Amino acid sequence: LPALKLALEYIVPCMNKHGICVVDDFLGKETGQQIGDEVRALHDTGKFTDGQLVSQKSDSSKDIRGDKITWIEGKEPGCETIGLLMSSMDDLIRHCNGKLGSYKINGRTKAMVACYPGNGTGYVRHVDNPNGDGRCVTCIYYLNKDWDAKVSGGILRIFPEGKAQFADIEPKFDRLLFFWSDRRNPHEVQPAYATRYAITVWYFDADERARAKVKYVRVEL
Numbered sequence: 001l002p003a004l005k006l007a008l009e010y011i012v013p014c015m016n017k018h019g020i021c022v023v024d025d026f027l028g029k030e031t032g033q034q035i036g037d038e039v040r041a042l043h044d045t046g047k048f049t050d051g052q053l054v055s056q057k058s059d060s061s062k063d064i065r066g067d068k069i070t071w072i073e074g075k076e077p078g079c080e081t082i083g084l085l086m087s088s089m090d091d092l093i094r095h096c097n098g099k100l101g102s103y104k105i106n107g108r109t110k111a112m113v114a115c116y117p118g119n120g121t122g123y124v125r126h127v128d129n130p131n132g133d134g135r136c137v138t139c140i141y142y143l144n145k146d147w148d149a150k151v152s153g154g155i156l157r158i159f160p161e162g163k164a165q166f167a168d169i170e171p172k173f174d175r176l177l178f179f180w181s182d183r184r185n186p187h188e189v190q191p192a193y194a195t196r197y198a199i200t201v202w203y204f205d206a207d208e209r210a211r212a213k214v215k216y217v218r219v220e221l
């Protein structure tokens, strides 16, 4: 669908009502699988980190490591389709501007490409932006074809604030996810027993980001 119809008829109302929004089949099989090929290419050539240190053993060779990451601008060689994903995200947000809460989005981070190795590691419950660092919207794109959470785990579990319930989101291929980055959406990644790829971008509210600068940019006189 065109960025605008999806943004105006589905994403905006869904975010303002629930603070979470799931869009399936965002780019199609062709583009999605190309992005998967680029991400897997980055992983195979060692562009990722060794992984988040989960359990630090007194013996170093026993240290267990979890999610691996790499920051992608989208202009790198062999990342053109990732850059196209980021451009499409940016189009959606552009068409949403002024309608997502009271936020005026004026920037974003680079793309955090994450790979859970499938060694039973996940990601602890957390809030993305708990201290007003300027990020208002989390946007995640998943790449895992034929994912069976009953078999592979890796579910994203969100605990919407005030609501006695949690929302389970499987990291499905060609799935796009939006949710408020602040304390409204604490969330965790449940242990993944299969390789789990995702691409996250965070969008900045102009006012919050502007006053985060003093919350921490100097000029010699």
Ligand SMILES: Cn1c(O)c(C(=O)NCC(=O)O)c(=O)n(C)c1=O
Pocket (backbone or CB within 6 Å): 067, 068, 069, 114, 123, 128, 140, 155, 156, 171, 187, 188, 189, 198
């Ligand atoms: C700061 N940070 C996160 O907030 C992640 C996160 O919330 N992922 C949700 C999901 O993949 O469904 C994450 O995965 N990684 C690697 C990370 O570094």
Ligand SMILES: [Mn+2]
Pocket (backbone or CB within 6 Å): 126, 127, 128, 187
């Ligand atoms: Mn998170």
